[PDB]
Amino acid sequence: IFDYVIVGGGTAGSVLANRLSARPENRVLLIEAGIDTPENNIPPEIHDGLRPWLPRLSGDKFFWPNLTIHRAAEHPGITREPQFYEQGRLLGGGSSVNMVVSNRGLPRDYDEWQALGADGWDWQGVLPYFIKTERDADYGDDPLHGNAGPIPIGRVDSRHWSDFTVAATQALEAAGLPNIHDQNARFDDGYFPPAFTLKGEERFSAARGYLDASVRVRPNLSLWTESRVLKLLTTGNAITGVSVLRGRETLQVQAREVILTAGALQSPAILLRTGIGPAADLHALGIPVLADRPGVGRNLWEHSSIGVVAPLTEQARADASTGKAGSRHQLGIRASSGVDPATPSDLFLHIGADPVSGLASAVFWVNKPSSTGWLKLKDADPFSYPDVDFNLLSDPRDLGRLKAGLRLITHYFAAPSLAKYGLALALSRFAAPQPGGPLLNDLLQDEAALERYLRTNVGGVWAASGTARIGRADDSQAVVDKAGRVYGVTGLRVADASIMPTVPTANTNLPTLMLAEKIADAILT
Numbered sequence: 068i069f070d071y072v073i074v075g076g077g078t079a080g081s082v083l084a085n086r087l088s089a090r091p092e093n094r095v096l097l098i099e100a101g102i103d104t105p106e107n108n109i110p111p112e113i114h115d116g117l118r119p120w121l122p123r124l125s126g127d128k129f130f131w132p133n134l135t136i137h138r139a140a141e142h143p144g145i146t147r148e149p150q151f152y153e154q155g156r157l158l159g160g161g162s163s164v165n166m167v168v169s170n171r172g173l174p175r176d177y178d179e180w181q182a183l184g185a186d187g188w189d190w191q192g193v194l195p196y197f198i199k200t201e202r203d204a205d206y207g208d209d210p211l212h213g214n215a216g217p218i219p220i221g222r223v224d225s226r227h228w229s230d231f232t233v234a235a236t237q238a239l240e241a242a243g244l245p246n247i248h249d250q251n252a253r254f255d256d257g258y259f260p261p262a263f264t265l266k267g268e269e270r271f272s273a274a275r276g277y278l279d280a281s282v283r284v285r286p287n288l289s290l291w292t293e294s295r296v297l298k299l300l301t302t303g304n305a306i307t308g309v310s311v312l313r314g315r316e317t318l319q320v321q322a323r324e325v326i327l328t329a330g331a332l333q334s335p336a337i338l339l340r341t342g343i344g345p346a347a348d349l350h351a352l353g354i355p356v357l358a359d360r361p362g363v364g365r366n367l368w369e370h371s372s373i374g375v376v377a378p379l380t381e382q383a384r385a386d387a388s389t390g391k392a393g394s395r396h397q398l399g400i401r402a403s404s405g406v407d408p409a410t411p412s413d414l415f416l417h418i419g420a421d422p423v424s425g426l427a428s429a430v431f432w433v434n435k436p437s438s439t440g441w442l443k444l445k446d447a448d449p450f451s452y453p454d455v456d457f458n459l460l461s462d463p464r465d466l467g468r469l470k471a472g473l474r475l476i477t478h479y480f481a482a483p484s485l486a487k488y489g490l491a492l493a494l495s496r497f498a499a500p501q502p503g504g505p506l507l508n509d510l511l512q513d514e515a516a517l518e519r520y521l522r523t524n525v526g527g528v529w530a531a532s533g534t535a536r537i538g539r540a541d542d543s544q545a546v547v548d549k550a551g552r553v554y555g556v557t558g559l560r561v562a563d564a565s566i567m568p569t570v571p572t573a574n575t576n577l578p579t580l581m582l583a584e585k586i587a588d589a590i591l592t
């Protein structure tokens with residue numbers, strides 16, 4: 068019988084399988100639905116870290132195919148449609164298909180988690196785990212940083228910036244923003260070279276860092292790939308195993324503990340199908356109630372995104388080609404919309420230029436939003452995806468933040484070092500930079516068209532989180548305790564981005580690594 072069965076070998080599941088199997092006495096099985104990515108056969112679309120958008124251009128090969136979501140909140144006069152939402156289906160999960168940035172957020176995010184009932188998940192409580200995961204090439208010997216962890220984190224050198232980047236930084240300085248250098252240990256507003264994870268030009272997923280060739284030969288560690296968990300097995304109020312599809316065979320596997328790391332959209336669907344969820348929703352589908360947990364699938368967080376693109380004028384194109392560090396990430400911007408003063412540093416922006424597509428871009432997102440959504444089962448079948456409603460821009464502050472970021476963009480591009488390029492900025496969906504949207508200067512004058520455009524075209528940043536949140540022992544909307552244990556049953560934990568009480572002011576991979584390290588420590592102690 069396995070001591071731990073870990074469902075989903077993504078970012079979190081990779082950490083948990085490594086840390087829990089480090090004790091020889093723990094017999095650990097990690098199950099992952101997608102392909103393996105062993106060192107001798109990492110697919111090339113995955114392996115190319117300098118082109119980390121590559122997986123998104125190979126259609127659904129590396130993702131949960133036809134996983135569709137509703138994005139923006141329903142609103143009068145707009146007909147929304149289901150949208151494909153990319154989630155990794157392969158060892159390493161999101162870390163195998165992501166944009167390779169590695170950032171922590173801000174102390175306030177985690178102090179918030181503790182204020183909302185996650186005891187010991189304040190900044191002081193999470194920092195050691197941010198330190199444990201990382202090996203920072205630039206600042207690793209400094210306080211607040213790690214120099215020994217499995218996940219490399221580095222930045223491009225300022226001196227290697229393209230003339231286009233330099234020009235954008237001058238525009239930001241004219242707007243009063245300074246270079247803060249280290250977004251992971253300096254927490255006021257400003258711009259910086261983004262921290263990212265790469266091994267030279269190679270992607271370096273959680274699978275490569277936590278499931279390395281030595282880990283894989285641990286005799287107490289079993290790894291099943293192309294293996295899909297269908298259902299949790301139960302005995303009374305204990306979870307006691309899983310049922311697994313491996314090819315055309317179904318297998319039962321006993322476990323002392325099952326840890327769900329199936330991703331923020333799919334972990335809570337497993338919980339619902341197991342009968343852990345809002346009792347009225349479960350009755351509605353004839354699913355026996357094991358525990359009435361009204362928080363399951365609620366509290367769905369995301370980062371709300373939009374793009375701006377312009378054709379590259381000759382000067383801009385030339386300026387864009389002078390960088391000395393290839394197509395790595397060059398520039399990120401942390402800023403305050405001022406919409407709700409209770410939430411500083413609520414915007415993340417990037418300005419860059421791509422000679423290949425021939426476009427300059429200013430993409431950004433609401434990095435600390437106010438809206439949340441939810442997901443529910445469509446039906447009881449184990450193969451169905453959940454019905455997901457991100458409900459973006461349901462809180463009007465988020466709409467105000469989108470408009471403010473667009474005005475910021477206008478301001479930066481009005482500064483001399485950017486205005487000299489003569490770029491004609493137009494709107495675009497965030498993840499599809501392309502022609503077709505209106506001019507930014509024209510749209511901003513038309514309040515009703517602006518709002519309609521934003522509610523129609525708002526996107527996410529793959530930051531799905533919060534659907535099985537940590538919370539206090541007496542809180543009926545909490546799903547798991549401070550160690551990931553699912554309230555109402557035994558033998559079951561959740562330990563992926565589902566457990567975040569709120570989305571951080573951060574892309575979610577590094578906070579996921581951190582939370583997985585913290586949960587693993589809690590289990591082990």
Ligand SMILES: Cc1cc2nc3c(=O)[nH]c(=O)nc-3n(C[C@H](O)[C@H](O)[C@H](O)COP(=O)(O)OP(=O)(O)OC[C@H]3O[C@@H](n4cnc5c(N)ncnc54)[C@H](O)[C@@H]3O)c2cc1C
Binds near residue numbers: 101154159
């Ligand atoms: C396209 C994309 C770009 C991104 N860009 C970045 C970025 O640059 N930086 C950043 O910090 N974050 C970014 N993110 C987000 C970040 O990578 C995710 O938040 C993180 O991977 C979440 O980790 P996780 O363990 O919760 O889920 P995942 O890594 O998604 O892992 C869940 C795993 O569970 C498996 N699984 C699910 N159901 C079953 C089942 N029934 N049986 C067996 N296995 C199952 C999956 O196949 C998957 O491998 C991006 C994500 C995407 C998708």
